Design an enzyme around this catalytic site. Structure first.
Site, short mmCIF file in Angstrom:
data_model
loop_
_atom_site.label_atom_id
_atom_site.label_comp_id
_atom_site.label_asym_id
_atom_site.label_seq_id
_atom_site.Cartn_x
_atom_site.Cartn_y
_atom_site.Cartn_z
N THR A 1 0.84 -1.23 0.00
CA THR A 1 0.00 0.00 0.00
C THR A 1 0.87 1.27 0.00
O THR A 1 0.48 2.33 -0.53
CB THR A 1 -0.93 0.04 1.29
OG1 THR A 1 -1.81 -1.10 1.31
CG2 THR A 1 -1.73 1.30 1.37
N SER B 1 0.86 -7.54 -0.57
CA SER B 1 1.19 -8.74 0.15
C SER B 1 0.13 -9.80 0.23
O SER B 1 0.42 -10.88 0.77
CB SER B 1 1.72 -8.41 1.51
OG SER B 1 0.72 -7.85 2.30
N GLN B 2 -1.07 -9.57 -0.29
CA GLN B 2 -2.07 -10.63 -0.21
C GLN B 2 -1.59 -11.74 -1.10
O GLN B 2 -1.97 -12.90 -0.93
CB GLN B 2 -3.46 -10.15 -0.67
CG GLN B 2 -3.51 -9.46 -2.03
CD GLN B 2 -3.50 -7.95 -1.95
OE1 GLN B 2 -2.75 -7.31 -1.17
NE2 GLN B 2 -4.34 -7.34 -2.76
N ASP C 1 -0.84 -6.63 4.79
CA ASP C 1 -1.63 -7.87 4.94
C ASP C 1 -0.89 -9.07 5.46
O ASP C 1 -1.39 -9.77 6.35
CB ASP C 1 -2.32 -8.27 3.65
CG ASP C 1 -3.26 -7.23 3.17
OD1 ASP C 1 -3.36 -6.16 3.78
OD2 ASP C 1 -3.88 -7.49 2.15
#
Lengths: 326, 326, 326, 326
Positions: free
Chosen positions: B12, B58-59, B90
């Site tokens: 993000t 990071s998901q 995440d």
């Protein structure tokens, strides 16, 4: 004194082990009478009537115990002044939420459990059950929805969750806080969930003998999509994603779920993150995938609500509205 | 000023939205030089050398970015005075735990992210980067294992976890607290992790192009054993269960895993519960089943240690020894 | 079995109420023998010897009991293998810190209380005391400074504070975290306090019969300067300010203090805020005023450190350094 | 768009500091016009009218600014749709509560501050202000009493408190939770204070030019009773006790308060413990002394309620019923 009915389902509060200075125990070693006779102070506050509904560890809680419980509360509501449902701590937050949306009885409905088995030193069960009855007996508890009373605290069934694996203070309403605190037999209620509960909901499991299949998938790094696929191949009515961060899915799990949603499966995005809302208007376009963002509802609670919602609708936009009101 | 290598992975922090007052955003829209060019104060504390390892949210973190980061840091350790990994929030907590065990550099290795995209009003990335660099450049941070620096706080990569889906103050070491707090570019350190990390671990991924397969199954009331069964059919080397309460498993799930273990599938009992340890000596006989108790390691952290434990052994008793040392 | 000495000072743990379901009570109702003898499981883990030092409620705790406990623990360090100090909960965090700076015994020193009187339902004292001995008996508890064992948690005497007025789980190290958790009589320590404690401090009360006078004045909107004036007027040695936000003083309070400082009074700026540090470099020029910033120490813990520093020096900057290491 | 009136009092929200990476700063360095203009998106959601009431650090807040502030919102209630009061974070929870009992305008009255000075990196001020205006412009905020909007959370003026000396997420309603969370400009309210506020309180300061004299004394071990005597000799109408544990008092403080109560002085027992209620029915026989238990009202908030109770009654019992209602 108030007539309070105690629906016993089992749990650690009924569990005992080798000793008081040893943590080992197994759930459901005592019945509803022994629990009550073990807390004879109950007799000075309520006219107690116990009934063993089941006697399981809540890790084995299921739809049938749920249907059974709701039907029972609704059916005997008119007969008693309030309820106390003794339950294990493990899945108590799920049951409390389920009853919170299917129980039409707005008389006090309190759930109580114990983190220490009855055999332990400084067992929390006695006072817990005693305090639980103090709540089911307070008139001010009516119309607050289904409650959870643990550690001298009255918690709403929707927000209450189990915070710590062993702490006696583990139950907390992590997003919105508790409704009240108990001291010397008295409760000072300073809140009530604004979400719609009990008699203000449309969920009616009275004629339901089974709840729709809704499973849960966990997201993390390099998450496999086998779990999601397994549930989809078995034709689940819904799947809730215990997503990462703000409701996000591992790419391959997102794949399976988007396919699912577009071919009929109800899919709810929740998060494995303990507090906070899985919002829409973040990284995911739910509208485009027919995904529902779950709000402050964690996975297991989002499953409770999706199942009930699926009893009324299969439409993502409908389910979303439900997730926005209940 | 010290030389800090910033290994950018996406997130993000390097992400944007069409608006500063709208919550929508897409990750990986920014480059490390831009993240670094945006915080010119960096130049007043460090000689920064940014390298963009990958660009993902990071998901979507997977074992290969882990392998890459592990090796990259290990190879470049002598070429720099510290590292700062810009990562999505995440799964930042899993990546930090993995580096914590596989990194052999005891020079400050610091992970950092942002809950607000670069575009947002009051975006938190800026100062978070400043602080992460402040941390990697503080010689006191060496030997503390992989760190996560968020919200003016230095956290150990083992205990650190995302607590809230949206709060900038989301990362918290929920069981043992932070190592230190950053004020005015200075860190007061009052703790350090005691579990063995980095150079003290037996995990060497330097020759590894792949890690063992470890899935995580979720426990809830009426849980389907489908996910677990899918993981065992796919041949998974290990299965971490995010159980209920203190590591408890729903009947069917328990049965599937208890059998999987009998056939060599390493099974770890963790907990959907946010804090606390899934202990041995509660209700499950790990010994009779060949299950390992995760301790304070939540599902996803337990999966990091399992995969690595699985590079060293298949014996539950040894894996359990691993889960007690690291 | 370890020889453990139980120096009892009184408090709720050895208190009693007319009822198990009434919150009312009075402290110092039970002697040490009765106390120890009420947890007969104690003799199974330790060879306990009890000694009543005083029998008061910690609300009336004071300098003399601190010095008495300190001398007693030091004098007796050689006879025993660890200590357990039963104390009221009100000021247990002050004594814990005090003894954490003045006890030169590095064998386990554990403080313990009970939030509920011995007479109450699910009374906490018994398992608290049992767990306090499981700790004082653990050799791994040595060299960690003075500890407070409550709610299955080992907390360093420096950071630990009473978080809630009635919750059995009230005691928490709010800034840095607990050192370890007690499950089934075993402690998994993952931390240890980094600040200098016990034998690493220069405080020697062995020959002290009194401690320098240090008062605490509270800051709030429209704060009166009268209390600070009274302390200065009585010729106090140190004045700790429980300030607003990051250690801020209300004008008339800032005034009495800037002057008092000017004329030879040690002034520590602490904060009414429960967590976090009263730092240097915010709005107040400690340098210009000769004010000492308390760091993460709450008003009352700051009092403990200033009195003891005041036994060593009167110099603001030497004091600030003491505030920076102990 | 809604007509929202921004009343400025100063604070960090309008404070600048020499560096965007130096913790140092001074309040009152920006004016309302500049504050408003700085966040021009405000224009997209409201018709903002800024009015600089005062320009001070809240550590200097006083009765006068409170009376003026109440009188202004009360008088101008009809000219606007909502009020946003910028304010220092130090005594914000105090003003928030003053206005909560004296403001009869039930249109959104929202307080906002900032922990980071405007000149800082990742300043929180901008988005806090923006979000505070979102709140004041949401008609759902009408009737919830005076609010505090910080870190994307809507908090009630009564239970809201500064939890950390420096954390931007420091504002929390420690006992009953927040009213709602702001995400993407929308608020999800799920609660509103049950205690009586604004128009439901009999408090009227419209003709008042000064509030009764109430001071707070701190309790700690060996607590001097000087501060309490100082306030007494000076004729204070009320004395709030920042007591140890459940509102307990150090012996000598107790005596001075008991004697002062006997002579008409209103003595309210609060606690220095950050969360939980100072209850009756514990160790202190309030009635026997003419003391008032503060409930969950911290010392500074209980000073607010006491000054006000003191503008209506001097009777301990009447003052106690006020504390049970407001």
């Amino acid at each position: 004194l108030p007539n309070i009915t105690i629906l016993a389902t089992g749990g650690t509060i009924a569990g005992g082990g080798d000793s008081a200075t040893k943590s080992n125990y197994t759930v459901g070693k005592v019945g509803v009478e022994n629990l009550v006779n073990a807390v004879p102070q109950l007799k000075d506050i309520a006219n107690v009537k116990g009934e063993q509904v089941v006697n399981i560890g809540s890790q084995d809680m299921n739809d049938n115990v749920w249907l059974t419980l709701a039907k029972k509360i609704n059916t005997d509501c008119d007969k008693t002044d309030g309820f106390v449902i003794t339950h294990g701590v493990d899945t108590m937050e799920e049951t409390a939420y389920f009853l919170d949306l299917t129980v039409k009885c707005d008389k006090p409905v309190v759930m109580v459990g114990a983190m220490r088995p009855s055999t332990s030193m400084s067992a929390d069960g006695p006072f817990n059950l005693y305090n639980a009855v103090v709540t089911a007996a307070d008139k001010a508890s009516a119309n607050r929805g289904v409650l959870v009373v643990m550690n001298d605290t009255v918690l709403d069934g929707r927000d209450v969750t189990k915070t710590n694996t062993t702490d006696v203070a583990t139950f907390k309403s992590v997003n919105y806080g508790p409704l009240g605190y108990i001291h010397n037999g008295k409760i000072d209620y300073q809140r009530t969930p604004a979400r719609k509960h009990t008699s203000d909901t449309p969920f009616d499991v009275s004629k339901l003998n089974e709840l729709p299949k809704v499973g849960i998938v966990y997201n993390y790094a390099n998450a496999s999509d086998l779990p999601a696929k397994a549930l989809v191949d078995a034709g689940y009515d819904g799947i809730v994603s215990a997503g990462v961060g703000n409701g996000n899915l591992y790419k391959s799990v997102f794949d399976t779920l988007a396919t699912a949603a577009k071919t009929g499966t109800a899919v709810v995005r929740s998060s494995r993150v303990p507090t906070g809302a899985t919002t829409q208007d973040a990284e995911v376009d739910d509208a485009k995938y027919g995904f529902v963002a779950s709000g402050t509802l964690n996975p297991q609670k989002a499953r409770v609500l999706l199942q009930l919602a699926l009893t009324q609708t299969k439409d993502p936009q409908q389910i979303q509205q439900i997730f926005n009101q209940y």
